[PDB]
Amino acid sequence: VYDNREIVMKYIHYKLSQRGYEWDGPVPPVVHLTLRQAGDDFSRRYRRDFAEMSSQLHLTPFTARGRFATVVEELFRDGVNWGRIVAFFEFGGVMCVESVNREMSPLVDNIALWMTEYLNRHLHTWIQDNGGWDAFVELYG
Amino acid sequence: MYVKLISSDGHEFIVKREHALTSGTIKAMLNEVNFREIPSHVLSKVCMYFTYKVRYTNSSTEIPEFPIAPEIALELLMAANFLDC
Amino acid sequence: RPVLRSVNSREPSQVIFCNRSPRVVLPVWLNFDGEPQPYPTLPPGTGRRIHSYRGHLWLFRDAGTHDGLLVNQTELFVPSLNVDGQPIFANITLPVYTLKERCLQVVRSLVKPENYRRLDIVRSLYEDLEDHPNVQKDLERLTQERIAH
Amino acid sequence: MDVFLMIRRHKTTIFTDAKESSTVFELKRIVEGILKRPPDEQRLYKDDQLLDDGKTLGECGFTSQTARPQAPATVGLAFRADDTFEALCIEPFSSPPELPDVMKP
């Protein structure tokens, strides 16, 4: 029942802010505070994987659509749980920061579009049948 | 060259002197040795380990499991702890 | 920081885990922090082809009693880089246990741990049954041997 | 191909090894060097049948699979007694006690 566009907009804005790059159905402020804390906690627990994806990425204007569609597919291939959604969000921040490192900043708008479309199409079904975002913040808080 | 290990029930076991030195306690006693507390069924197994150890140590051959019957384990354990092998 | 650990080299190395022992072999990999991690076991007499990386550390124990096993006639195994498309062989062979330790193995398997004291044995041997072969204990011993080197 | 043996007579047991190609007379000479008894004054048996000096250890039934170090094969020994020879007599080993109840699954 929450706008999935604001959730991904406010998240990539925070991931690009931690690197100092800046950027451009109600939504409560609590779902944003939990998603940032969970993504940072996820990154700390799997720092060996965070540096792994940041190196093996190799982002180009054409493989960017190839990398996103292949990684997100392999990420949810077993199923959909809240821990994999946090990894899904964190993977979006990885491909956005790595895009602006190689000075491909316009890809942030394309990645934010791909994340919003995948949430509304392939993940909106599971999130509703699990209490929504208000249940996700209760598992972490 | 051989030695004679004698069990508590009078059985005499003749093994090669090289194999008997696997037990450091047997080496200090050296000829013949009398074990007043190791019966024949236990001392015969100890001699079988001597021939087993000498053949398979420092060998790339596939090493088989050394069998030990359940009814002989406690006695063979005490016999091995004294012999240091 | 730890002494015995695997180097994150990320260089693939093909290994063959050949179980040349009557025991069910448990492969043990030492991660990049020296912690031992368990891997799928091997039935007696079987062999499996393994994806590993160069510069990693492997142990092999009995899956039921953690008894020490020799891999290529030693305790540790380090996969080197392959050549001519041949996998590096890791022959897991049974060691020549001392007659005492082999006796300790049979008694531990037959007598339950809470019944080691009800055995009419010496009090010293009672403490030898309770000292099960432990992987963390062998790591501390195999680390001090590298320091003496 | 090496076989591992247990030459036994009365309360004596000899632990030795030999090749399957080695003859029985050669095994008797091994007993000779140990017990100081000539091979002609010896009668070697397998189970219950008397072995001839011409046959090899393999031809009698001693193979590396049935004569391992951890479980050697038993050979009977008989010493010449006055004008005739010896009736085979191998005194058995001791009997271990009964299994304590802290061992039966």
Numbering used by the authors:
A (entry chain D): 8 to 31, 87 to 203
B (entry chain C): 17 to 46, 58 to 112
C (entry chain A): 60 to 208
D (entry chain B): 1 to 105
Article, verbatim:
Hence, acknowledging the fact that linker geometry could play an important role in defining the ternary complex arrangement, we developed a PROTAC, WH244, in which we replaced the flexible alkyl chain of 753b with a more rigid 1,4-dimethylpiperazine. We reasoned that a rigid linker would maintain the overall tertiary arrangement of the complex as 753b to efficiently degrade BCL-xL and BCL-236. Furthermore, another improvement was made wherein the morpholine group in the BCL-xL/BCL-2 warhead was replaced with a one-carbon bridged morpholine (1R, 4R −2 oxa-5-azabicyclo 2.2.1 heptane), with the intention of decreasing lipophilicity. WH244 in the BCL-2WH244 ternary complex structure adopts what resembles a “horseshoe” conformation with the linker forming the base of the horseshoe and the VHL and BCL-2 ligands forming the sides. This organization results in the α3 helix of BCL-2 being positioned in proximity to VHL. A cluster of salt bridges and hydrogen bonds are observed at the ternary complex interface centered around the carbonyl oxygen of the amide moiety of the WH244 linker proximal to the VHL ligand. Here, N67 of VHL participates in hydrogen bonds with both the carbonyl oxygen of the WH244 linker and the side chain of R110 of BCL-2, which also forms a salt bridge with D92 of VHL. Further reinforcing this interface, R69 of VHL forms a salt bridge with E114 of BCL-2 which also interacts with the amino-moiety of piperazine linker of WH244. Comparison of the BCL-2WH244 ternary complex to the BCL-xL753b and BCL-2753b complexes reveals that the orientation of BCL-2 in BCL-2WH244 is completely changed relative to that of BCL-2 in the BCL-2753b structure and instead resembles that of BCL-xL in the BCL-xL753b structure.
